[PDB]
């Protein structure tokens with residue numbers, strides 16, 4: 001890992017935290033009557049970064065018998081400096097309607113929260129039975145709009161992280177661990 | 188699993204098989220000199236089903252120093268049913284151009300091959316440096332159109348399988364193992380639906 005200046009979390013540490021978060025989520029919905037087909041917990045995976053976190057999380061939720069429905073969404077920037085609001089173009093939205101369902105947006109990392117805040121509100125306006133967010137990493141001090149994730153795997157400082165779905169110029173997403181991109185590489 | 192007739196592959200087995208296939212992919216591409224930033228192997232993950240296989244395969248590829256760049260597309264054909272609609276719908280195509288790059292389509296299962304045939308004929312025209320496919324499961328005797336994947340983790344019978352990303356009406360994709368869905372379970376759902 002010559003391109004990394006430090007290891008944040010190993011695959012093992014990540015695996016354990018997700019399991020804890022999943023047990024937590026499971027307990028939290030224990031009284032919502034989740035059932036496959038008719039009342040599953042809808043996971044809205046925001047591409048591309050959360051693809052790895054989502055794969056491991058849904059399996060951990062499966063361990064606690066929480067029936068889920070996987071949705072993947074693809075968003076795009078409108079252009080540079082065209083929005084304050086965090087508005088994004090929807091290239092791929094949910095396949096089914098979330099109206100009346102329990103929904104959980106899955107993200108890899110939240111910092112400014114501009115896009116996640118915009119997405120939260122958009123889905124909120126579609127009337128799901130409930131709406132919450134689970135983010136793997138949270139750069140709490142990087143906010144540009146106020147926003148709180150309901151479930152978070154780890155809070156971290158303002159370092160550029162890569163690995164476990166997280167990229168730098170679309171490189172390193174495949175690492176099993178989360179590491180800090182060393183400055184000399186970004187330079 | 189009450190809804191399962193039987194387990195085809197456990198998580199451990201799938202894991203074991205994915206490692207061996209990743210090792211082969213590494214050996215086979217060694218001569219291409221794949222490098223991060225300038226020459227990664229482009230992985231085209233076919234959503235939704237391929238999401239899990241893709242997450243575990245890219246890590247296994249990482250173990251063998253194969254640098255990759257992920258592209259996520261979305262294609263639909265079965266919908267809420269058990270059989271091919273006979274039509275393949277492109278919901279989301281690649282963000283970047285595949286022209287001049289080494290591309291590996293990553294799929295969860297191939298049966299009639301209408302999906303992969305559709306994809307190959309679309310991507311081949313874009314002139315990638317090379318185009319290959321890795322499918323987790325292959326129902327070899329279910330073809331409507333011919334198709335031979337470059338890498339196959341396992342050959343299976345024509346029965347409906349779920350788990351490890353594979354669904355029946357967008358249900359069961361989260362299972363850690365791959366299992367055979369009982370016809371009584373899908374039949375009751377089919378009836379409730381139609």
Ligand SMILES: O=P(O)(O)OC[C@H]1O[C@H](OP(=O)(O)OP(=O)(O)O)[C@H](O)[C@@H]1O
Nearest residue numbers: 047048049108109110111112113114115
């Ligand atoms: O709260 P923010 O300041 O927006 O930071 C976090 C977002 O940015 C990254 O996505 P990106 O735009 O990189 O797309 P990607 O997931 O496909 O890499 C990351 O994947 C989060 O979605």
Ligand SMILES: O=P(O)(O)OC[C@H]1O[C@H](OP(=O)(O)OP(=O)(O)O)[C@H](O)[C@@H]1O
Nearest residue numbers: 235236263264265297298299300301302
């Ligand atoms: O060889 P074929 O008969 O074309 O069948 C295989 C395709 O059907 C399934 O996808 P589906 O259309 O169900 O979409 P999904 O991946 O979102 O579940 C499977 O994931 C393959 O993509």
Ligand SMILES: Oc1ncnc2cn[nH]c12
Nearest residue numbers: 111159160161162166167
């Ligand atoms: O450190 C970080 N690593 C990867 N993506 C993002 C987005 N915000 N901050 C990031």
Ligand SMILES: Oc1ncnc2cn[nH]c12
Nearest residue numbers: 298346347348349353354
């Ligand atoms: O067995 C099977 N399970 C899920 N999807 C498909 C498509 N073709 N065959 C399938």
Ligand SMILES: [Mg+2]
Nearest residue numbers: 046047048049
């Ligand atoms: Mg993202």
Ligand SMILES: [Mg+2]
Nearest residue numbers: 049166167168
């Ligand atoms: Mg990114």
Ligand SMILES: [Mg+2]
Nearest residue numbers: 233234235236
């Ligand atoms: Mg598919």
Ligand SMILES: [Mg+2]
Nearest residue numbers: 236265266354
């Ligand atoms: Mg399907």
